[PDB]
């Protein structure tokens, strides 16, 4: 229950819990890469109007099976969505998704095309995760591709220019940068009891490899200039 992957999953849920609670009441939210809808229950209990987008139709089909009434699912990738939509967004959420379009675009193009509104971004910084090798979490660079193994699952990802992305964000927003290591809030996830969360935070405080994993998942709290 205290594997590196389980603790990473809980800390990710902690950040998502705090970020979604922090959105201004009644915001019109764009969630980039909504996927299978893990954040559905967090949006469901808030006064928010949410549009969840994704490039993969199969992922959105799963999200539809239990989607809240305040979430609308659109099968469009970020760049195509921002062009076509009539919506005016007042908050942008992007949890572990932006590194995909950043790998195929100039980071200033992605940043300039984001709606000019507050945002929360969680993104792996591959250069800070490289070489971490634990039984349930590993990141290796194979030629030009990143192989991120999380338990018995492997994500193959392309490189993106993290350094250019951070400078692009600073040109458009007041940026507050952090990482998952900064999280203290218990995830909304009912399966993570207060006793389990206490044990996970105690493990993080005592294990440098776990700290390195959480430190490589960068958080950005953005307010437009
Ligand atoms: N260009 C793009 N625009 C929108 N979504 C994209 C994208 N490239 C990849 N994605 C999607 O981004 C998702 C990342 S997985 C994370 C899903 C969800 N945000 C969560 O935190 O649980 C995947 O579903 C993937 O299909």
CA distances 25 to 46, 51, 119, Å, are: 8, 15, 14
- Structure-solving method: X-ray
How far apart (Å, rounded) are the C-alpha atoms in residues 24 and 29? 10
How far apart (Å, rounded) are the C-alpha atoms in residues 80 and 91? 18
How far apart (Å, rounded) are the C-alpha atoms in residues 219 and 208? 19
**Quick check: CB of 100 below 6 Å from ligand 1?**
yes
How far apart (Å, rounded) are the C-alpha atoms in residues 120 and 97? 12
**Quick check: CB of 147 below 6 Å from ligand 1?**
no
Q: Helices (DSSP H) in the chain: which residue ranges?
A: 4-22, 40-44, 57-64, 78-84, 99-103, 107-113, 126-129, 162-172, 194-206, 208-215
CB burial of 88-106 (b: ≥16 within 10 Å; e: otherwise) equals ebbbbbbbbbbbbbbeebe
How far apart (Å, rounded) are the C-alpha atoms in residues 35 and 17? 17
Give the number of the atom of ligand 1 that is nearest the alpha carbon of residue 94: 19
The domain of 176 spans: 4-224
Contact 175, 121 (CB under 8 A): no
Contact 126, 162 (CB under 8 A): yes
- What residue owns the CA closest to ligand 1's atom 2? 77
Please state the domain count of the chain.
Answer: 1
- Terminus-to-terminus CA distance in the chain, angstroms? 43
Give the number of the atom of ligand 1 that is nearest the alpha carbon of residue 100: 8
- What residue owns the CA closest to ligand 1's atom 22? 38
**Quick check: CB of 35 below 6 Å from ligand 1?**
yes
How far apart (Å, rounded) are the C-alpha atoms in residues 169 and 111? 6
Helices 208-215, 4-22: crossing angle, 10 deg rounding: 40
Both structure tokens of 28: 């019109």
Name the pairing type of β-strands 145-150 and 137-142.
antiparallel
**Quick check: CB of 30 below 6 Å from ligand 1?**
no
SS3 86: coil
Contact 180, 11 (CB under 8 A): yes
How many Cβ atoms sit within 10 Å of the Cβ of residue 3?
15
SS3 43: helix
Q: What is the CATH number of the domain that holds 94?
A: 3.40.50.150
Both structure tokens of 29: 């939210």
How far apart (Å, rounded) are the C-alpha atoms in residues 110 and 85? 16
SS3 115: coil
- The candidate with the shortest Cα–Cα distance to 190, out of 77, 83, 41, 48, is 41
Q: Report the Cα 83 to chain-centroid distance in Å.
A: 22
- The candidate with the shortest Cα–Cα distance to 73, out of 60, 59, 90, is 60
Strand partners, 158: 145
Q: Which residue has the tokens 């995760």?
A: 129
C-alpha 202 to ligand 1 mean position (Å): 31
Both structure tokens of 211: 């700290």
Q: Which residue has the tokens 């099968």?
A: 75
C-alpha 96 to ligand 1 mean position (Å): 7
CA distances 104 to 41, 70, 90, 168, 217, Å, are: 31, 31, 26, 16, 20
Both structure tokens of 53: 């987008």
């Amino acid at each position: 229950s205290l594997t590196h992957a389980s603790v990473l999953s809980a800390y990710t849920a902690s950040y998502k819990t705090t970020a979604i609670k922090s959105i201004a009441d009644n915001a019109v939210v764009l969630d980039i890469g909504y996927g299978k809808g893990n954040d559905g229950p967090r949006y469901a209990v808030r006064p928010l109007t949410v549009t969840g987008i994704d490039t993969a139709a199969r992922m959105l089909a799963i999200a539809d099976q239990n989607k809240p009434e305040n979430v609308t699912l659109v099968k469009q990738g970020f760049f195509t969505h921002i062009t076509k939509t009539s919506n005016t967004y007042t908050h942008v959420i992007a949890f572990n998704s932006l590194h995909y379009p950043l790998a195929s675009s100039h980071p200033d193009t992605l940043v300039q095309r984001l709606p000019t509104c507050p945002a929360n971004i969680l993104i792996p910084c591959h250069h800070l995760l490289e070489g971490i090798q634990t039984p349930t979490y590993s990141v290796v660079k194979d030629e030009d591709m990143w192989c991120v193994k999380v338990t018995k699952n492997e994500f193959i990802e392309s490189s993106y220019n993290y350094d250019v992305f951070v400078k692009a964000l600073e040109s458009k927003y007041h940026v507050t940068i952090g990482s998952l290591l900064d999280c203290v809030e218990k995830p909304s996830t009912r399966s993570i009891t207060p006793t389990l969360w206490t044990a996970m935070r105690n493990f993080v405080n005592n294990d440098q490899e776990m700290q390195r994993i959480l430190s490589g998942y960068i958080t950005f709290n953005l307010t437009p200039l």
